[PDB]
Amino acid sequence: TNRSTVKISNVPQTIVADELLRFLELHLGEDTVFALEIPFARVQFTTLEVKSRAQLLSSQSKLLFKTHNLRLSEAYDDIIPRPVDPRKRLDDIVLTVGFPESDEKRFCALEKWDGVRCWILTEKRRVEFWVWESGDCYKIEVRFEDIIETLSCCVNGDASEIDAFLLKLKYGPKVFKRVTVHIATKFKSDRYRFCKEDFDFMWIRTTDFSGSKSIGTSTCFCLEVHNGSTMLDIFSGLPYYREDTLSLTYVDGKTFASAAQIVPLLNAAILGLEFPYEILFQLNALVHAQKISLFAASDMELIKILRGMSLETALVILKKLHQQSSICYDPVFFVKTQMQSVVKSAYKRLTEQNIMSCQRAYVTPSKIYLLGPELETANYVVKNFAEHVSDFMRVTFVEEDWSKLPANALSVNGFVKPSRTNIYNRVLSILGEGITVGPKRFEFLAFSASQLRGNSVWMFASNEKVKAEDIREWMGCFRKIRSISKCAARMGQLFSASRQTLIVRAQDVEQIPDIEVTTDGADYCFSDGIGKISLAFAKQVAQKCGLSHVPSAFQIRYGGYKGVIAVDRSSFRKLSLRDSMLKFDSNNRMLNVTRWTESMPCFLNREIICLLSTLGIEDAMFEAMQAVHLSMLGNMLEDRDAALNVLQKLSGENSKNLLVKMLLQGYAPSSEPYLSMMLRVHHESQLSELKSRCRILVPKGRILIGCMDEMGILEYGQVYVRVTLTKAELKSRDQSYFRKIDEETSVVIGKVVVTKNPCLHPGDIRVLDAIYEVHFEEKGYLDCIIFPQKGERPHPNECSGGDLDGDQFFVSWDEKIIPSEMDPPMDYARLMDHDVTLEEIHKFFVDYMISDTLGVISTAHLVHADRDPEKARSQKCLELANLHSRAVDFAKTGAPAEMPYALKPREFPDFLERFEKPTYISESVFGKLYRAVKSSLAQTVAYDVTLEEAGFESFIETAKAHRDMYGEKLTSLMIYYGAANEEEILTGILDMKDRITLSVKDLHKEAMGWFEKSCEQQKKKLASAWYYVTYNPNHRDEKLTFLSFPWIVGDVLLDIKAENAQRQ
Ligand SMILES: [Mg+2]
């Protein structure tokens, strides 16, 4: 319960471990100390009886070495994780990994290991098995969440009822390797040495040590323990322990041994002509999800039954097999039952609805996890190659728990050289040789920047029609690119979502030169990515995007000139691009607009709050703004303000949202059940965000796309910010921070704080001056901060490392957070002849995994910023800001940003919900916001529908089938991914693709709803909407529990409600 690791009190640095080893011998029992640490010293004892006796002697205060007293304090983190309970440390056991081969009582002994040291750790929730395969030692650790079922087994004779203990895993263990340095053993106390049993060496994560790779291809661990008197262990401490002991007999698992370093959990080549894109992937998906066993899919019966039957029914039956949460030990029986009890548009929907059925694969450190076809937003590559959409595969590299791969897993990081571990080599080998799910071999083609951040890789099966290399030829990569950075940029440019604007003539594209100052040594270009566009081209681009207004600037990727282009009414050339926007060469002379300039609501971040506090904004100022935010959030369940205060701006909802529709012209949020539940979900999301990432909205502030003034009027330290006034801002206008330009928009006149999204170094917070230019009408910039054309240094450049390639700048006129003084900024300062190879791109991906994520670097900066007197100007914080800049620049220079141990957060703020880390209270630097958030958190309508929304007699009742079909589809989606009882598009938002899986059934319902409507439409569309409302609300006692079927036609329902209210 304490791990016997006692944090020693103040001790001198001139202390010998052998001295304390022998001194403790004269004070406690003989050889009764396990481990010892001296840098805040730690001593681990053998048991909890020898511990609490030193504490008893510590309370007696007798122990005093030399002239220094010892105050043995509370138990800190374990020096070496060992089970203090003598019984929990099981040694010399027989461990066999396998799967139940679809019988629930027979086990595939894939590989048997003898001498396994099973350490069942409760405080640190993990059971670590120490194996000794070959000549090296490996540790197999389950995580107490891997175990979905622990069973009491009887593998040998029935004389002993309890002989083995099964450990059914759902994610798969993390395998480590015993690697030593053979260095001097003393090192005073040393970190892992001084142990009684010589627990030296390091534990680096590696792959399946078994030649047969039995660890990966096994979903269960069997622990043949010598004694069955261990009921107390392997009990409710191990999750899901049934008391019903099962008789388990071993079977030969030699037929499932695969030596392939890729995809160790797939079916063998025992298929004649079976289609792998629709069964083998789905069968392997079932095996990985453990819905059926590996022998359940490799058996002749199921293979022959699926081969004989139709493919569409096969997809349906395999999906239904994947539906149930238990392990189907009789997939043949399930398939036969669904066959006998069968109860009897087009795949190219991405060309129209921009949604693909992608077959993603999470490649863990030692296992493959195929996840079948899943609906996500389509990208340009599949948009072009929809003929082979089933040949794509979104390969993601995870850490055996569907979590992000740690840098420690892929790199060792007391070491002389950063030697990459076996996980990095495995990822490189998989990216090279590809994933082979049967006949289809998925080999790497390219990845996106977000995919790089998400550790996701696309792989194409080399179909006979088009090879996986020809698509790379289409995308323009690996053709003539010379640098890995620009190769990755070109690869990612064709994956990010965008809108295809008008095709632009190459002759109409002017090339206006860049603006560079080149002062103070650094070469700084003012027009780093900002271009131009004519007003006519702007209007046609706007209507191409889908807007009725002309945005000030568009973030574009036209050809290779990636950047943002502003609307100049003086400009007559169509596109007037620049050289500084060039990233790669491309003949695709057509605009690809990602996002335009809109007045996106502002919201602070923990990094922005940290820097503003460091520059001199008191914590009592942020707390007041968060108090206003929490006041706005508390009454959203009880006031109509949520229509234009929470959903409109705090969340991603807009004027076309259904909740906004029924709140702008509807009743209170708590009146309607669907409205109340969706508003409660939004409330939970906003509170969780504000508690995690302090998105404190500033009404006097807007996050705006950076832009440059194309005329020389704006000077250094001066910016132009003309923003369309919000409704609340329209109500309270004509202030010192604004002046009326039009009936709708106003330009800031006062001081403005400007910083980029990362915003980690004190100095990116720039207190610029918002000035009104007499040329506001001539150029008409809107919802975009206008950086000066000339000056000592470009303002986005001194905003950390920002530039006008579409980077959004945090701009707020709110005087409360505007610093009195601004810190002077950081400096923010190779075409190898070997060209770009596929292996080089794989190495770039691997090294990006080596580099620590921007999120963890920002979190560590927060940790080191919440205690130091200089919050962000601290040496730790400045060095880690430089490291964060290196991590951002990794997309340009492939040097991983390995955060050192000195910069690692030893103890984490209470604001960050890091339960594994040792938390310290953070009442110093705006940690009061978390406490305020917690304090704020811890402070049918059928008749109404039939009256004010269903006045016209519908009497259709055709929506009952939809409620039994679309409701069935929603229940299927909830069973597949969801966990709550929500039936709306936010079902998975408790979410990356749940809004895509959902809102498609509603889109299917919308198609189904109009299909059942014969159109006028008052007798068809309104009738169907009223029938759905009556089916859901009036018969809510039925077995539907949806409350969202009428919301699929919710626009029509709200229109009918307004029409009935208009007639009244
Ligand atoms: Mg940028």
Numbering used by the authors: 7 to 45, 56 to 360, 368 to 436, 440, 442 to 856, 861 to 970, 980 to 1030, 1046 to 1070, ...
Q: Could you share sentences copied from the article?
A:
In plants, transcriptional silencing via siRNA-directed DNA methylation requires RNA-DEPENDENT RNA POLYMERASE 2 (RDR2), which associates with DNA-dependent NUCLEAR RNA POLYMERASE IV (Pol IV) via direct physical interactions that bring their active sites into proximity. We report the structure of RDR2 and experimental evidence for how RDR2 engages its RNA templates and initiates transcription.
Full-length RDR2 expressed in insect cells using a baculovirus vector was subjected to single-particle imaging using a Titan Krios instrument equipped with a Gatan K3 detector. The higher-resolution RELION map was then used for model building, employing Buccaneer and manual steps. Following the N-terminal region is an active site cleft composed of multiple domains termed slab, DPBB1, connector helices neck 1 and neck 2, DPBB2, bridge helix, trigger loop, connector helix neck 3, and head, respectively. The three highly conserved aspartates (Asp triad) required for phosphodiester bond catalysis are located within a loop of DPBB2. Extra density at the position of the three Asp residues is seen in the RDR2 EM map, likely corresponding to a Metal A Mg2+ ion. Examination of the electrostatic surface potential shows a positively charged surface, starting with the RDR2-RRM and continuing along the cleft and into the active site. However, an intriguing difference between the enzymes is that RDR2 behaves as a monomer during purification and upon imaging by cryo-EM, whereas the QDE-1 proteins were crystalized as homodimers.
